[PDB]
Design a protein around this ligand. Structure first.
Ligand SMILES: [Mg+2]
Ligand SMILES: [Mg+2]
Ligand SMILES: [Mg+2]
Ligand SMILES: [Mg+2]
Ligand SMILES: [Mg+2]
Ligand SMILES: [Mg+2]
Ligand SMILES: [Mg+2]
Ligand SMILES: [Mg+2]
Ligand SMILES: [Mg+2]
Ligand SMILES: [Mg+2]
Ligand SMILES: [Mg+2]
Ligand SMILES: [Mg+2]
Ligand SMILES: [Mg+2]
Ligand SMILES: [Mg+2]
Ligand SMILES: [Mg+2]
Ligand SMILES: [Mg+2]
Ligand SMILES: [Mg+2]
Ligand SMILES: [Mg+2]
Ligand SMILES: [Mg+2]
Ligand SMILES: [Mg+2]
Ligand SMILES: [Mg+2]
Ligand SMILES: [Mg+2]
Ligand SMILES: [Mg+2]
Ligand SMILES: [Mg+2]
Ligand SMILES: [Mg+2]
Ligand SMILES: [Mg+2]
Ligand SMILES: [Mg+2]
Ligand SMILES: [Mg+2]
Ligand SMILES: [Mg+2]
Ligand SMILES: [Mg+2]
Ligand SMILES: [Mg+2]
Ligand SMILES: [Mg+2]
Ligand SMILES: [Mg+2]
Ligand SMILES: [Mg+2]
Ligand SMILES: [Mg+2]
Ligand SMILES: [Mg+2]
Ligand SMILES: [Mg+2]
Ligand SMILES: [Mg+2]
Ligand SMILES: [Mg+2]
Ligand SMILES: [Mg+2]
Lengths: 15, 394, 153, 97
RNA sequence: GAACGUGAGCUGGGUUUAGACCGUCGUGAGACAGGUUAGUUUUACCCUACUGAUGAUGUGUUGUUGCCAUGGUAAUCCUGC
RNA sequence: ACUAUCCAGCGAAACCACAGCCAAGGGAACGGGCUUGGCGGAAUCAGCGGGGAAAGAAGACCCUGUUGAGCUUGACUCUA
RNA sequence: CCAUAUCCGCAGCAGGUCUCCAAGGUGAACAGCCUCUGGCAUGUUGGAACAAUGUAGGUAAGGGAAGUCGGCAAGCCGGA
RNA sequence: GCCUUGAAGCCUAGGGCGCGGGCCCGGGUGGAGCCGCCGCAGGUGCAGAUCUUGGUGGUAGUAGCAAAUAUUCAAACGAGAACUUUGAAGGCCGAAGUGGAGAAGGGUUCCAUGUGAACAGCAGUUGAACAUGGGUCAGUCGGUCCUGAGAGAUGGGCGAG
């Protein structure tokens, strides 16, 4: 289906 | 959190609905109040904008560094033929405001006034005021109309007069006249009816309204610019070069919880063609027209007491985009709203004038009639020829 | 075949029909609601003019995105467009109908358009090629038409 | 009507391209019934089919300016772009000597 | 102050992946609350709100001239004789 | 200058409980819907990006699991 | 056929895929600019008008890094 | 027991029953089998499961049909021309080319006549599409021959095979 991001970005980031 | 540094806002919220107006002629919101001591006079007048130029004069402001010296300053020229009266209207005062009570038109109304009706004058039959004008050449109409002026003496407090212009006398493409209501301010109601009832169907020049060295107001509609952004309509900072989705924008609007956009924030829309009102513009000069005793006379439009050259106000090549002025005009200090060929309204000042910068008086020395269609360097053709000489026009 | 709304007097009326026609349903529907109730000779002028951009059709239900015009003040509206293609195919039909009336022996220059009906139809299938290896359908949207004319002036 | 076949064939007989071939815009009937060779070579002889001439490319402009560069002109300091060794090298000058 | 206002408004210097360098610790793979360098920032054509633009209700139709509810609202400081 | 804009012709998608004007109150403690007040007028056009705790990917951070795998060794049991 | 349409890339996909031949002028020159032989119809459509925001190009009075994490980007010098 | 003097199934502002599960009548369509009682047996009753298969909507006549400078005038065929063809004019490729020939791969795409349903993301009188027919000629051009890095039988050895 549609693409929506590169898997090494992971837009929700909170460490 | 708060704002790091401080700054003031961009624009006024007074002029807020920046929409393009619903008119082409300046409306007057308020006229001056009236002392019943005064003689009977008028308050306003219609004129058109022609052009601009500059002027030299001498200065008698004391205590200054420019006193007893010459200065250079710009002006605007406004063409103003004499208007014509056609009709009357009387108002009355009520706890809801004012109310239009009754009106009267005259017996003869020229066609240039009737074109203000009749969107399509070309395929019309021109059957306006045909039946109303039949109760002037009549017996009962003389009884019918004159039973009404008596009412207006009795049940009214405010008198206004309908006038229109003379558009044959201009170079423009237009033929329709412009109407306007004007207020009569004087002693008493009965006087103003008698003054007007005599003055009906007659002409009214400018020198019967205004004089020299007087502050007035100017009312007219500004110059269009169309759809614009916020860096032209509101004058915000341009963002820097490294922005992605555009640069001539305002970034933030509001914050989260007032979860709505407020009318205080800048947006992108119309600019220009608005209604405005400016005050305290001076009159320097009132010029005559072209006229004929036995031949021509076009000197006194633009001849000071000093230069004594047989010159008119008109430049070489005429006024740009306008034409040729052949009529009486007025000369304002500074600048005004609107394009050329546009209709202006000229209202007396509603205040008292005691500042020396208003009370002072003026006498001109020089006026510039160079051509504005380039870099003009000559005042008149005659000097242009005497300097250069004979060309191949031989 | 079997029409909708079989008429009131089958001796003073004619009829025509088309099936499986490559025009857009949406524009064509609206053009029919504007031509309805007219005398045929009036309407043929109406449809030439649309083709020449001198009159218009107002888009009243299917109006998303559609633009504003000056000719739709006659109809009491703002929006309008000039669907050429639909106009022609309607014109070809009026001919078929007008002839049949001549064959049954009717007064031709007193005829009225009473009933026009448009309907959808089976959809044709193509494809278009998008990013990241994807495919999507480029489908078509044709129409049927049927219509009735009677003799009333 | 269609005449692309007739164009192609005439190219091969005249040994020119298809941009050098003139067909008569008026006598198109008699050409379209030329669906072969020997229906064509007749028509070349009759004059309906012609080989155009070359577009001119002249040289007087060059011959003229070179005739000046012999005498010396157009050779100053501000017309030179390569080192002297590129224009006329030293090794050659040595060998002549 | 307003989700320590505001990343489909910017930037991405720092911090907080993947490579790598020193010091201290661990036999060791490896760790550091120690330091240093390089490093992909997506989508508006939907509903609303906001700004601008047509039109709508009624007054028999149509036009000219005008009144006012209601809402906004703006002027501010210093020097010199 | 190419677009966006308008017209002719052809014509998709993601997404979608129902839907879509605000303040305060209480409530799973930050409501489009409830309660008390403010108010409320067809159908639409170009934009912009405040909200919809907007779309995408059964949270890689943290914990649990008597679920795993890569690597090391002085863990246990074995082996070429 | 041998490639901005016959090959592989889901497709007449701005991608990728081994070689031969090789004129005139300027100029050091298979650089770049114009032309002849041979080839084409502007690269999956057209017409009207010149708003906003964009993308690619340019210019700017006086001052000259005061901007910004950082002279990032642009500009100066440029051949003999 | 019901039935081609009309079964099942389906539709229904119609008449009615039962607390409910559900049912009986009436009217239209339709064309061949179906039901009630006492017992038996079970692949036996759906709103959902980021359920499975198929189909259809708002979105929406919207976003879009913008990398590489460029078209114009007349005539002809034709029901029919912004796009076919012919001519003329203006322009690009600029010999490391948008030119003329070939290997790998494809496999009839090649050539003529005809067509305009479908396809050629607009159109088309055109087409590498559709239909019907035709077309590749060798003592000397290549293979075939030789061997290369290397692969691989016999004898022998090993191995449950
Ligand atoms: Mg502050
Ligand atoms: Mg950036
Ligand atoms: Mg000028
Ligand atoms: Mg695509
Ligand atoms: Mg692909
Ligand atoms: Mg925050
Ligand atoms: Mg972001
Ligand atoms: Mg945000
Ligand atoms: Mg960093
Ligand atoms: Mg690292
Ligand atoms: Mg007020
Ligand atoms: Mg748009
Ligand atoms: Mg609230
Ligand atoms: Mg609370
Ligand atoms: Mg909600
Ligand atoms: Mg938002
Ligand atoms: Mg989880
Ligand atoms: Mg998980
Ligand atoms: Mg446990
Ligand atoms: Mg494993
Ligand atoms: Mg051990
Ligand atoms: Mg070039
Ligand atoms: Mg083209
Ligand atoms: Mg192509
Ligand atoms: Mg500067
Ligand atoms: Mg600094
Ligand atoms: Mg700073
Ligand atoms: Mg740089
Ligand atoms: Mg049977
Ligand atoms: Mg069973
Ligand atoms: Mg079951
Ligand atoms: Mg179900
Ligand atoms: Mg359930
Ligand atoms: Mg569009
Ligand atoms: Mg393109
Ligand atoms: Mg070739
Ligand atoms: Mg080639
Ligand atoms: Mg090959
Ligand atoms: Mg097509
Ligand atoms: Mg072929």
């Amino acid at each position: 289906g549609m693409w929506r991001f590169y898997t090494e970005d992971s837009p929700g980031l909170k460490v | 959190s708060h704002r790091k540094f401080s700054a003031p806002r961009h624009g006024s919220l007074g002029f807020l609905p920046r929409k393009r107006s619903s008119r082409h002629r300046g409306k007057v919101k308020s006229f001056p109040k009236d002392d019943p001591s005064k003689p009977v006079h008028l308050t306003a007048f219609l004129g058109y904008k022609a052009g601009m130029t500059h002027i030299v004069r001498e200065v008698d402001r004391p205590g200054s560094k420019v006193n007893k010296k010459e200065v250079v300053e710009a002006v605007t020229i406004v063409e103003t033929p004499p208007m014509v009266v056609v009709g009357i209207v009387g108002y009355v005062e009520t706890p809801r405001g004012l109310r239009t009570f009754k009106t009267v038109f005259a017996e003869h109304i020229s066609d240039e006034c009737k074109r203000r009706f009749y969107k399509n004058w070309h395929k019309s039959k021109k059957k306006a005021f045909t039946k109303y004008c039949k109760k002037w050449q009549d017996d009962a109409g003389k009884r019918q109309l004159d039973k009404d002026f008596s009412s207006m003496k009795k049940y009214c407090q405010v008198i206004r007069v309908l006038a229109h212009t003379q558009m044959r006398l201009l170079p423009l493409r237009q033929k329709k006249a412009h109407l306007m209501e004007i207020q009569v301010n004087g002693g008493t109601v009965a006087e103003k009816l008698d003054w007007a009832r005599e003055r009906l169907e007659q002409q009214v020049p400018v020198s019967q309204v205004f004089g020299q060295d007087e502050m007035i107001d100017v009312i007219g509609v500004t110059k269009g610019k169309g759809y614009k952004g916020v860096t032209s309509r509101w004058h915000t900072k341009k963002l820097p070069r490294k922005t992605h989705r555009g640069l001539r924008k305002v970034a933030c609007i509001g914050a989260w919880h007032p979860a709505r956009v407020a009318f205080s924030v800048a947006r992108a829309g119309q600019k220009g063609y608005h209604h405005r009102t400016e005050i305290n513009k001076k009159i320097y000069k009132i010029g005559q027209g072209y006229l004929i005793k036995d031949g021509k006379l076009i000197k006194n439009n633009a001849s000071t007491d000093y230069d004594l050259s047989d010159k008119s106000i008109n430049p070489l090549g005429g006024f740009v985009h306008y034409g040729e002025v052949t009529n009486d005009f007025v000369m304002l200090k500074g600048c005004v709203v609107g394009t050329k060929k546009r209709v202006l309204t000229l209202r007396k000042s509603l205040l008292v004038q005691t500042k020396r910068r208003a009370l002072e008086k003026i006498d001109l020395k020089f006026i510039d009639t160079t051509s504005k269609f380039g870099h003009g360097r000559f005042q008149t053709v005659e000097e242009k020829k005497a300097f250069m000489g004979p060309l191949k026009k031989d | 075949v079997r029409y909708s709304l079989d008429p009131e007097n089958p001796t003073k009326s004619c009829k025509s029909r088309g099936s499986n026609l490559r025009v857009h349903f949406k524009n064509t529907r609206e053009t029919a609601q504007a031509i309805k109730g007219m005398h045929i000779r009036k309407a043929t002028k109406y449809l030439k003019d649309v083709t020449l951009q001198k009159q218009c059709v107002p888009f009243r239900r299917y109006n998303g995105g559609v633009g504003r015009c000056a000719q739709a003040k006659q109809w009491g509206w703002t929006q309008g467009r000039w669907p050429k293609k639909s106009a022609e195919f309607l014109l070809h039909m009026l001919k078929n109908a007008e002839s049949n009336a001549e064959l049954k022996g009717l007064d031709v220059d007193s005829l009225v358009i009473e009933h026009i009906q448009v309907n959808k139809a089976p959809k044709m299938r193509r494809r278009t090629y998008r990013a990241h290896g994807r495919i999507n359908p480029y489908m078509s949207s044709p129409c049927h038409i049927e219509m009735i004319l009677t003799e009333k002036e | 009507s269609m005449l692309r076949l007739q164009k192609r064939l005439a190219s091969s007989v005249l040994r020119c391209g298809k941009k050098k071939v003139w067909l008569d815009p008026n006598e198109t009937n008699e050409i379209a019934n030329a669906n072969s060779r020997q229906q064509i070579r007749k028509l070349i002889k009759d004059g309906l089919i012609i080989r155009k001439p070359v577009t001119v490319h002249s040289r007087a402009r060059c011959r003229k300016n070179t005739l000046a560069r012999r005498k010396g002109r157009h050779m100053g300091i501000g017309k030179r772009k390569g080192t002297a060794n590129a224009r006329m090298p030293e090794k050659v000058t040595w060998m002549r000597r």
